[PDB]
Amino acid sequence: MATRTQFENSNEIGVFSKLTNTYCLVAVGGSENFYSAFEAELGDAIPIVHTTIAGTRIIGRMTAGNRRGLLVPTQTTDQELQHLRNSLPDSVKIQRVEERLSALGNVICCNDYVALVRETEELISDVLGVEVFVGSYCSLSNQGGLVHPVNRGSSVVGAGMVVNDYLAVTGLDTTAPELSVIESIFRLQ
């Protein structure tokens, strides 16, 4: 269930990765083991899309969404948006949101049933079809959510790890107590 990987020796894996129940986003790179680990566990059940946002290496902060649809920041290039639309299945929607700060995931976290952040709130609710009430310090899914009180006590829970309804990923700095906490909060066992 759980997975452990290093993004070019980096400890924060959630920054360059994003996971949902219908699609996955991973930053482009030359590490065969990094992508191989994701592919082996996820197989071909969902598309593991090699993509970037506005040409930036980080994608977890920029991208936030659920299985119903994906929200892209304003600064995303049109070519990247078209590539994401092609890679995402027809059943998954994509909507652009006008925001001053391109880091959507810094303040926005959501799952297949609930979301968090009124123009943007209602847009998120409509696109994701979920209720809307700390994105950098929060993580949410259908198996519950985890917030600040991973990666040897890193306080940025929303950047060091990413997890979906059936697969969890954490950095190599994660310790056994942190893995147990992640398993318990997300009721993997």
């Binding site: 049109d78 070519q79 078209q82 639309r85 092609n86 994509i94 652009r96 949101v97 001053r100 700060l101």
Partner: protein
């Protein structure tokens, strides 16, 4: 690429041209040449300046989701672009003739 419209004069901004300093305030700065950038810096009111479309369009001098990009969809754009360009050119010519 993304060809923006210069907000000071509603002019095209082709790739590689113009200046856009990324200020911490996070604002778009779209311009076609140093003239428009300095005019904006000088705070020359585009809505009341004769040589900018922002004022001309009103003074009477002149009139969120992606697309899958299928072969059929683009095929329609080929004729649509020409039709829209012809309509706009004819409307502008009629407006100029009326102004004369």
């Amino acid at each position: 690429m993304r060809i923006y419209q210069c907000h000071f004069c509603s002019s095209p901004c082709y790739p590689g041209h113009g200046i856009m300093f990324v200020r911490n305030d996070a604002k778009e700065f779209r311009f076609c040449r140093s003239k428009c950038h300095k005019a904006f810096k000088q705070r020359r009111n585009p809505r009341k300046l004769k040589w900018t479309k922002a004022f001309r369009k009103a003074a009477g001098k002149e009139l969120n989701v992606p697309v899958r990009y299928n072969r059929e969809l683009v095929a329609t754009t080929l004729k649509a672009m020409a039709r829209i360009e012809e309509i706009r050119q004819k409307r502008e010519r009629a407006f100029y003739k009326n102004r004369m």
